[PDB]
Design a protein around this ligand. Structure first.
Ligand SMILES: [Cl-]
Length: 184
C-alpha cells in the first residue's frame, strides 16, 4: 503493498541512513509516489511489453534517474535495454539459462545487470560471470545475513536484499547491504 505503508517504510529506512532504496511494485501509482518521495531505484515489475515501455517513458518524463525493469521473459529486458532502462533485473530459474541471458544482455550493451534468485548458487555464478547487482531474496534474518556475508567476501560490490518485511531490510541495512528493495 500500500502507498502509505511504502512511504512509511521508505521514510524509516531513509531516516536510518539507507543510501540506496529501491521500490518494487506492479502498480504505476506506487512507483510514482516512491519517485516523488525520493526512492532511488524504481523497479518496474513483470508486465506486457507495451505496458512496460509506456511506464518506463512516463517515469522518465517524470524524472526517474534510475529505472529497473524486472522480467523473466528476455524479450522485455531487451526492449527495456533499447528504451534505455538503467537496470535489467534477470529473474531466471535455470543456472545455464541465467549466464546465457546475462551474456547476450551484456553483448547488447547493458551496463547494469541484476540477477535475482533465492538460490545462492545462482547468485555466485552470477557474481563469477560479472553480473553487476546480486539480488538476494530473503526469508530468514540469519539466513540472509549468511548469504550477504559470503557474497561480500566473494567480492560482490553491489548486493541487494529483497523482502516485504521491514525487519529483514533493516538488518540488511545494518549489515551493509548496498540496495534495500522494498517489495510491494
Ligand atoms: Cl527485484
Amino acid at each position: 503493498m500500500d502507498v502509505d505503508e511504502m512511504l512509511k517504510q521508505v521514510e524509516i529506512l531513509r531516516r536510518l541512513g539507507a543510501k540506496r532504496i529501491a521500490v518494487r511494485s506492479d502498480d504505476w501509482r506506487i512507483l510514482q509516489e516512491a519517485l516523488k518521495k525520493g526512492g532511488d531505484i524504481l523497479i518496474v515489475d513483470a508486465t506486457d511489453v507495451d505496458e512496460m515501455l509506456k511506464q518506463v517513458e512516463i517515469l522518465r518524463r517524470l524524472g526517474a534517474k534510475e529505472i529497473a525493469v524486472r522480467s523473466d521473459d528476455w524479450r522485455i529486458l531487451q526492449e527495456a535495454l533499447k528504451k534505455g532502462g538503467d537496470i535489467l533485473i534477470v529473474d531466471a530459474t535455470d543456472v545455464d539459462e541465467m549466464l546465457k541471458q546475462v551474456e547476450i544482455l551484456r553483448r547488447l550493451g547493458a551496463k547494469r545487470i541484476a540477477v535475482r534468485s533465492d538460490d545462492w548458487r545462482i547468485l555466485q555464478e552470477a557474481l563469477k560471470k560479472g553480473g553487476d547487482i546480486l539480488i538476494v531474496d530473503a526469508t530468514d534474518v540469519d539466513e540472509m545475513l549468511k548469504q550477504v556475508e559470503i557474497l561480500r567476501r566473494l567480492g560482490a560490490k553491489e548486493i541487494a536484499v529483497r523482502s516485504d518485511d521491514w525487519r529483514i531490510l533493516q538488518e540488511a541495512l545494518k549489515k551493509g547491504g548496498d540496495i534495500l528493495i522494498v517489495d510491494a
